[PDB]
Structures are given as C-alpha cells and as structure tokens.
Design a protein around this ligand. Structure first.
Ligand SMILES: Nc1ncnc2c1ncn2[C@@H]1O[C@H](C[Se]CC[C@H](N)C(=O)O)[C@@H](O)[C@H]1O
Ligand SMILES: [Cl-]
Length: 225
C-alpha cells in the first residue's frame, strides 16, 4: 500500500467510508480559516492529497494578499490536486508542491494544516516537523492537527476501535478494492494518544492547545502560537 494512481483516484470515497466525522472537519477547517487566516500571510496544507482541506480553507478566506501552498510527496496525488483546484475560480492563488513535508520551508503562516498526515511520518520525525511549523507561524497563527488516536486505556481503545469498525461497515468500506491493503496499514500505523499530542505541541511552544473535535478514535486539535 502506497499512494499510487489507484489510491489517488478512490481517495475521497475511501476516506469518507473510513474516517468518522471527516466531512465535518473539512467544513470546520473552512470556519477556522475564516477566523485565523490573516491578510498578507500564507496557508500551508501539509500532505494535501486531493486538496479537500485546501479548498475548504480557500473558499472561506476573505483577506487580501493570502497565498496557499499545498504539499504532498506523491506525484499521483499532486497531479489530481492541482487539477482539482484549477477547476474552481478564486482570487487566492494556490501552489501545490510535490515534496516531502520534512524538507519544506514554512514561513509567514497564519495557518498550517496537518490533516491526518503526521501519523504517516516516522515517530522520531514529528517533533522536528512541529517545531519547524511552530517557527514558521506568525504570532496568533494556528496549526490544525487531525489524527487517528490511540488510547492508553485498553478497554476504551477497543471500544472505540469497534465503533470505528461499526461505522466502516455501515458505510460499506469493504466494497473498496483498496480496503484490505488500507486496513493492513492502519494496523501497523504508529498513532499517538490525545494527551501525547497536546504535551508535544505545548513543548514545541504553542500557547493554546486543545482538542476541538472528536468522533470515536479520530479527532482534531488546534495549537495557537
Ligand atoms: N512526508 C510526506 N510529505 C508529503 N506528503 C506526505 C508525506 N507523508 C505522507 N504524505 C501524504 O499524506 C497524505 C495522507 Se491522507 C491526508 C488527508 C488530506 N489531507 C485531506 O484533507 O483529505 C497522502 O496524500 C500522502 O501522499
Ligand atoms: Cl489518510
């Protein structure tokens, strides 16, 4: 399982059937962009995929001189992203780059989005990235971090994983061809608890850090510089 032509194609439907609340987060990201994106700044969408978060933010930014930069290291993903974005008109320019988030520069940002992406980085690479993001954000800038969480409490972790399997079934997740390779990946994915995420965000330097959304074992938080 890699992010190839096939995963890039079925992605909106795969993530819809597997991430509870996915869609509400995307809508909320637009609300957050309205609140946090300032004029004359940049907005980064890290591991941007098809550009759902990117367009949600773009559609809700009404400030001048704002630029969006989406980054995804998969070429198949980046091609559909750029094309998907050129299909909607806007006076806000968007540059989509094909790189690995660990090497990109982040500067003059009012908003950074890591929407279910951090979990795909080696655990030992996460602090460095979040640190670079903290340094690249302007004062009062915001990091929106959505992740699949693990729960220290075993019994709760299983209860939530089960609710997550009830949701996947309800949505016919297994109908997808990518369904099993995808499910194998999540089994070996090194996810963090919500508390781990908060403590690390605070250690990097963010002043405000809080979970603002959750549905079973998936959620999203915000860290304000
Ligand atoms: N190191 C990396 N650099 C850039 N993109 C990455 C990296 N690791 C994983 N990715 C990208 O991480 C994404 C995880 Se799925 C992300 C969901 C998407 N942000 C949305 O809002 O719908 C994939 O598209 C994948 O190619
Ligand atoms: Cl994903």
């Amino acid at each position: 399982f890699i992010f190839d032509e096939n995963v890039a194609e079925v992605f909106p439907d795969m993530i819809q059937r597997s991430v509870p609340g996915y869609s509400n987060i995307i809508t909320a990201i637009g609300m957050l962009a309205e609140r946090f994106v300032t004029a004359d700044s940049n907005v980064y969408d890290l591991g941007c995929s098809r550009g759902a978060a990117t367009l949600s933010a773009r559609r809700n930014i009404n400030q001048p001189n704002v630029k969006i930069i989406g980054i995804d290291n998969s070429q198949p993903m980046v091609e559909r992203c750029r094309q998907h974005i050129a299909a909607y008109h806007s006076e806000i320019p968007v540059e989509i780059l094909c790189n690995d988030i660990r090497h990109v520069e982040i500067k003059n940002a009012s908003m950074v989005i890591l929407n279910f992406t951090l979990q795909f980085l080696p655990p030992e690479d996460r602090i460095a990235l979040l640190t670079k993001i903290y340094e690249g954000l302007n004062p009062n800038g915001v990091l929106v971090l959505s992740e699949k969480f693990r729960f220290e409490d075993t019994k709760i972790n299983h209860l939530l994983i089960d609710l997550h399997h009830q949701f996947k079934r309800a949505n016919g997740y297994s109908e997808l061809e990518v369904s099993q390779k995808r499910t194998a990946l999540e089994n070996v994915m090194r996810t963090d608890s919500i508390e781990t995420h908060k403590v690390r965000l605070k250690n990097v330097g963010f002043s405000q850090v809080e979970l603002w959304f959750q549905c079973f074992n998936f959620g999203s938080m915000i860290a304000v510089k």
